Each structure stands twice: as structure tokens, then as C-alpha cells.
Amino acid sequence: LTPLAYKQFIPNVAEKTLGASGRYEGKITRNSERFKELTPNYNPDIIFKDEENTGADRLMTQRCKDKLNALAISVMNQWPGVKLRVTEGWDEDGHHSEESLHYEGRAVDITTSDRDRSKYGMLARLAVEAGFDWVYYESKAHIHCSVKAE
Ligand SMILES: [Ca+2]
Ligand SMILES: [Zn+2]
Numbered sequence: 109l110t111p112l113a114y115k116q117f118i119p120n121v122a123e124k125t126l127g128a129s130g131r132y133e134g135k136i137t138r139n140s141e142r143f144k145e146l147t148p149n150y151n152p153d154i155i156f157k158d159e160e161n162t163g164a165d166r167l168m169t170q171r172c173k174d175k176l177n178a179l180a181i182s183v184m185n186q187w188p189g190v191k192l193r194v195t196e197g198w199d200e201d202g203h204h205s206e207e208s209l210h211y212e213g214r215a216v217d218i219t220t221s222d223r224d225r226s227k228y229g230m231l232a233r234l235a236v237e238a239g240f241d242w243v244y245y246e247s248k249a250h251i252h253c254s255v256k257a258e
Contacts, residue, residue, distance in 0.1 A: 124207070165196070
């Protein structure tokens with residue numbers, strides 16, 4: 109269980125390559141038809157910042173849900189008392205560089221619920237083993253994980 113290092117990513121290739129999360133498919137919108145592909149995650153074992161208060165955070169694809177929920181489990185087991193925390197989910201706001209998987213509900217930024225920056229390296233390792241298609245120690249303040257489109 110070798111935690112990831114700052115700026116490290118597993119698998120060791122570019123996020124949108126085929127061996128990872130795959131191709132950008134197109135910004136999903138509130139109104140657009142694809143939007144119905146998103147369902148809200150109401151997992152009580154997961155903490156959603158939701159600074160938008162829109163509930164956008166909870167909105168993700170099914171695969172993204174699946175992996176996030178597995179990760180929720182292994183996080184508690186790993187550090188009892190602590191829970192998984194999502195800081196950023198689906199983006200309506202448009203504050204991600206063009207072609208981010210956030211626009212499609214396929215990517216999340218996470219921390220532990222206590223913001224102990226020391227557990228992040230390990231959090232990323234758990235996200236890899238929860239089955240996230242690309243895991244990346246994007247910042248010292250959060251792990252970025254994303255999933256293939258299905
Ligand atoms: Ca948020
Ligand atoms: Zn991200």
C-alpha cells in the first residue's frame with residue numbers, strides 16, 4: 109500500500125488516454141439531455157462540501173458513484189472516525205481548464221473529512237484500489253479522481 113506522492117498519478121499516463129479515463133465527450137449542461145445521465149449521490153458516509161448549495165456536488169455518473177461509494181467504505185475502515193469528503197463534483201460554474209472531466213460528472217476532488225493533509229497520499233492509494241480509472245495528487249489540498257464514460 110504505497111501512498112502516492114505529490115503530483116503523482118496512477119496509472120502513470122495522461123488522464124484522457126485510453127488506458128485511463130478515456131476521451132472528453134462534451135460538457136454536460138443543466139438543460140442538455142445528457143444531464144439525465146447524472147444521478148445524485150446521497151451516501152451518508154460521504155461528506156459533500158456543496159458550497160454552491162445547488163447540490164451539484166452530489167451529481168455524478170453511475171460509474172463515478174460506484175467507485176466513490178467503494179472508496180467511502182475503505183476510507184472509514186482505514187481511518188475509523190474519519191469519512192470521505194468531496195470538495196468538488198460536477199462543475200456548472202466553469203472554473204476548470206477546458207476539457208475537464210468535472211464538466212461531465214466523471215471527476216471529483218476529495219479529501220478526508222478532517223483535512224489532515226498527511227492522509228491524502230494514502231487517500232489517493234485507496235481511490236486507486238476503489239477502482240478509479242485515473243487518480244492524481246493534483247494539489248497538496250486534494251486528490252483528483254475520475255472514471256471512464258460508459
Ligand atoms: Ca462543492
Ligand atoms: Zn479535479
